C-alpha cells in the first residue's frame with residue numbers, strides 16, 4: 001500500500017522543517033521524514049552548539065581583561081565538561097521544541113531513512129513502507145568532507161566538526177586543517193579555551209573568498225590571538241603515536257623550497273576542508289534526478305529539480321550553505337506550491353554572513369574585487385576605516401575594527417559592506433536590510449550616528 | 463581693536479568643534495572660543511567616560527556568569543580607583559587630539575569665556591579682547607539641573623553627573639534621583655559595581671517618554687538587577703549625618719496615603735533631574751537674542767537665532783540632547799553658510815538613541831502611541847517579540863530581549879523600532895538607516911536573517 005500526502009519533505013533540518021511548517025499553514029497534508037535528530041545539522045552539530053562554544057570562548061577572552069578593568073585577576077582552568085553538559089542539554093531542549101512544532105502543525109513525523117523507488121509516480125520508501133505526493137522536497141543537507149586514505153594515509157585518525165561536538169575534554173594540542181569559516185571558528189574556540197592550536201592553510205591567508213580586507217585582517221587577528229597559522233602547508237600523512245598523533249606536513253612557500261615537518265604530540269586533528277551533500281543513498285537514479293559530480297542536487301531558481309514534482313533546498317544543493325538560506329528558500333517554495341505564488345523564490349544576492357571569529361566578521365554583498373569586475377574599476381569607489389574600539393582604551397590586550405563600504409556608479413549605491421570587530425555579529429543585520437533596499441552612500445550619510453558605538457563609524461565614512 | 467573672522471564659534475564641544483572643522487574645509491577663517499576643556503560635555507563628563515564606566519559595569523555583570531561558563535568563580539572587589547585613573551587618562555588623550563584637530567585645520571583657539579557686546583554689529587569679548595564675524599555660532603551646551611534650597615533644603619549636599627566623574631571611590635550606598643536616561647545609566651553602573659543603589663522616580667516606571675514597552679521592560683530589568691526603584695517618591699530634604707546623608711522622602715502611591723520615609727547612611731545622592739542651558743552669562747540681552755523661559759536659545763529649522771548672523775546648535779537649544787545631533791546640525795550649518803547650500807539643515811525626525819542600561823536599549827522613530835496619534839489607530843500595526851538570548855542558555859542569571867516594530871498604513875511603513883537586550887547598542891544603527899529610507903515590513907521580510915544572533919529576530923516577526 002501507498003499513503004498519499006500533498007507534501008513529503010525528506011529531512012527534518014533547517015530547510016525541511018521550515019518548508020513543511022509553512023506548507024501546513026496553507027492547508028497542505030504534509031509529512032517530514034527524519035533518520036536522526038530534528039533540527040538537522042544546525043541544531044545538533046552546527047550553528048547552535050558552535051555559538052554556545054563561541055560565547056564560552058568570548059567570555060574567556062574578555063576575562064583576560066578583568067584586572068585591567070579594575071578587578072582581581074581571574075586565574076582559572078576552564079572545565080570543558082561543565083559546558084559540554086549544558087550545551088548538550090540545550091540541544092535536547094531544542095530537539096523537543098522542533099518535535100512539538102511539527103505536532104502542533106499536524107505534520108506527520110516519519111522516522112527512518114528515505115529513498116526513492118522506481119515507481120514512475122515519485123514515491124519514497126522508509127522502513128519498507130511507501131509514501132507518495134505530487135510535491136516531494138529533498139532537504140537532506142550535507143556532512144563534513146574527510147580526505148581519502150589513498151591520498152592522505154591516516155586521515156581517518158582525524159575528526160571533523162561532528163567529532164568536535166563529541167569531545168568530552170579540551171584537547172591539549174590541536175591542529176585544524178582548512179581555511180574557511182568552519183576552520184576559523186573551530187581554531188579560534190579551541191585556542192581561546194586553552195588548546196595549543198595551529199591552523200593549517202594552503203595559501204597565505206584564511207577566508208580567501210571574502211573581501212581581501214577581511215581575509216587579511218582575520219589572518220592577523222588569529223595570529224595575534226595565539227593561533228599558529230601554518231601557511232602554504234598540507235598534510236601528507238597521519239600516524240598514531242604513543243601520545244596522540246604525528247602529522248606529516250609539507251610546506252611550500254613561494255620563493256622557498258618545499259620542506260617536510262613532523263608535528264608531534266597532536267591530540268586533536270580536525271579536518272575542516274569542505275562539505276559533501278547527503279545524496280548517496282537516496283536512489284536518485286531511480287527517477288533520473290540530476291546531480292553534479294560532487295552529488296549536489298541540481299535546481300533552477302525556483303528550487304525545481306529536473307523531475308516534475310520534486311524539489312530541493314538547502315545544503316544538498318551546494319549554494320549558500322547557511323541555515324537562514326535553507327529556511328527562506330523552503331518558505332518561498334511552500335508559498336509557490338501551496339499558495340500558487342508563481343514568482344515566489346529566494347533571491348540569492350545580498351545574503352548576509354557572520355563568521356564567529358575573535359572579533360566577529362560581518363559581510364553582505366560584493367567584495368571590492370567582485371564589484372570592480374561587475375561595474376568596471378572607474379565605477380567603483382570604496383570607503384574604509386580601521387580603529388581600536390574604546391572597549392580597549394583601558395586594556396593591554398587589543399583587537400581592531402576594520403570596515404569597508406563598496407559603492408557603485410555615480411550615485412554610490414552601497415553594493416557591499418565588510419567588517420570585523422567587536423559587535424559586528426549584531427551590527428550587520430540592519431545594514432543588510434539597507435543594502436537589500438538599494439541604499440546609497442547618501443542614505444548612510446543622512447542617518448544620524450549613535451554615539452559612542454562602533455556602528456556609528458559605518459555612517460560617518462568620508 | 464577688533465579682530466575679524468568669517469566664523470566665530472562659542473564653545474569647543476561636540477557641535478562647535480564639528481561646525482568649525484567643516485567650515486574651515488570650505489575656506490572659512492574660523493576661531494573657536496573655549497573656557498574649559500575641548501570636547502565639551504561628551505568627552506569630559508558625558509558620553510565617553512560614561513561608556514568606559516558602562517563597559518566596566520558590563521564586564522562585571524558578565525563575570526557573574528563565569529562559573530556557569532565553566533571557569534572557577536571570579537570573586538573580587540572592584541577597585542574604582544584603577545578604572546578612574548585609566549578613564550581620566552583616556553579623556554586627556556582625547557583633549558589633546560581635539561586640540562590638534564583645530565591646529566591642523568588652522569582654526570584659532572581663543573581660551574576664555576565669551577560674552578556678546580552691545581556693538582550693533584555682533585561682536586564678542588573674551589578676556590578684554592573683541593572679535594567679530596558675519597557668522598557667530600552659539601554652541602555652549604548645558605549643565606546638570608539641581609533643586610533650589612528653597613524647595614529642597616539640603617539639595618546642595620547631593621552631586622550631579624559632573625560630580626559622578628569626580629568620585630574617587632565607589633560609594634557604599636547610592637540614591638539616584640530621576641527617571642531619564644542619565645539617571646538610569648548612573649544607577650545601573652553604580653549598582654553593577656557594588657553600590658547598594660536606589661533609583662527614586664516620580665511615577666511608576668523609568669523612561670516614560672520612550673515606548674511603553676521600553677519603559678516597562680527597563681523598570682523590570684533594573685529591579686531584577688538589584689536596583690531598588692522607589693516609585694511615586696520625591697525628596698523633601700537632605701541633611702548631613704555622622705555617616706553620609708539622610709534623605710527625607712515622601713512617597714504617594716495612587717490608592718494609598720502619602721508617607722514620609724528617612725533614608726539613612728547615604729554616601730552618594732545624585733540628582734539626575736534635567737539639564738539647563740549654558741546661556742546666563744552670555745549677555746544675550748545686549749543683542750536681543752531670543753530665549754525661552756528656561757534660557758534655551760530659540761532657533762528655526764536652519765539653526766538661525768532671531769538675530770541675523772547668529773546661530774545656535776546643540777544642547778543650548780534644548781532639542782534632542784545628543785552628541786551626534788549637535789555634530790550633524792553643526793556640519794549642516796557650515797555647508798549652508800560656507801558652501802551656500804540654502805537647503806542644508808538637519809532633519810530631527812528618525813534620530814536614533816541608545817540607552818546604556820543593562821541590557822542596552824535602542825530606539826528610532828515613533829512610539830506606538832505617537833504613531834497612533836499621527837496615523838490613526840486603524841492605520842497602525844505593531845509586531846513584537848520577547849525572548850531570552852541564547853547567551854543565557856547556560857547561565858542561572860537571566861536578561862530578556864524585547865523588540866517592537868511599529869508600522870503605518872497599508873504598506874506597513876516601519877515608523878518605529880524599539881528594543882532592549884544584549885547587543886542592542888550595536889544593532890540599531892543599520893536599522894536606523896533603513897527607517898530613514900522609508901523601509902516597509904516587506905523590506906525587512908525580504909532580508910535574509912543572520913543566525914544565530916538576536917538581530918535576526920527583527921527580520922522574522924510575523
Ligand SMILES: Cc1cc2nc3c(=O)[nH]c(=O)nc-3n(C[C@H](O)[C@H](O)[C@H](O)COP(=O)(O)OP(=O)(O)OC[C@H]3O[C@@H](n4cnc5c(N)ncnc54)[C@H](O)[C@@H]3O)c2cc1C
Nearest residue numbers: 011013014015035040041042046114141314315321322323
Ligand atoms: C560546524 C558548523 C557550523 C555552522 N554554523 C552556522 C552558523 O553559525 N550559521 C548558519 O546560518 N549556518 C551555519 N552552519 C550551516 C547550517 O548548519 C546549514 O546550512 C543548515 O543546517 C543546512 O540546513 P538543511 O536543511 O539543508 O540541512 P540539515 O539541517 O543538515 O538537515 C538535513 C536533515 O536531513 C536528515 N536526512 C538526511 N538524509 C535523510 C534521508 N534520506 N532520510 C531521512 N532523513 C534524512 C538529516 O539527518 C538531517 O536532520 C554551520 C554548519 C556547521 C557544520
Ligand SMILES: Cc1cc2nc3c(=O)[nH]c(=O)nc-3n(C[C@H](O)[C@H](O)[C@H](O)COP(=O)(O)OP(=O)(O)OC[C@H]3O[C@@H](n4cnc5c(N)ncnc54)[C@H](O)[C@@H]3O)c2cc1C
Nearest residue numbers: 473475476477497502503504508576603776777783784785
Ligand atoms: C552624563 C551624560 C551622558 C551622556 N551620554 C551621551 C551618550 O552616550 N551619547 C550621546 O550622544 N550624548 C550623550 N550625552 C549628551 C552629550 O554630552 C551632549 O548632547 C553634547 O555634549 C552636547 O554638545 P554641545 O556642543 O551642545 O555642548 P558641549 O559638548 O557641552 O560643549 C559646550 C562647550 O561650550 C563651552 N562654553 C560654554 N559657555 C562658554 C562661553 N561663554 N565661552 C566659551 N566657552 C564656553 C563649554 O566649556 C563646553 O566645552 C551625555 C551627557 C551627559 C551629561
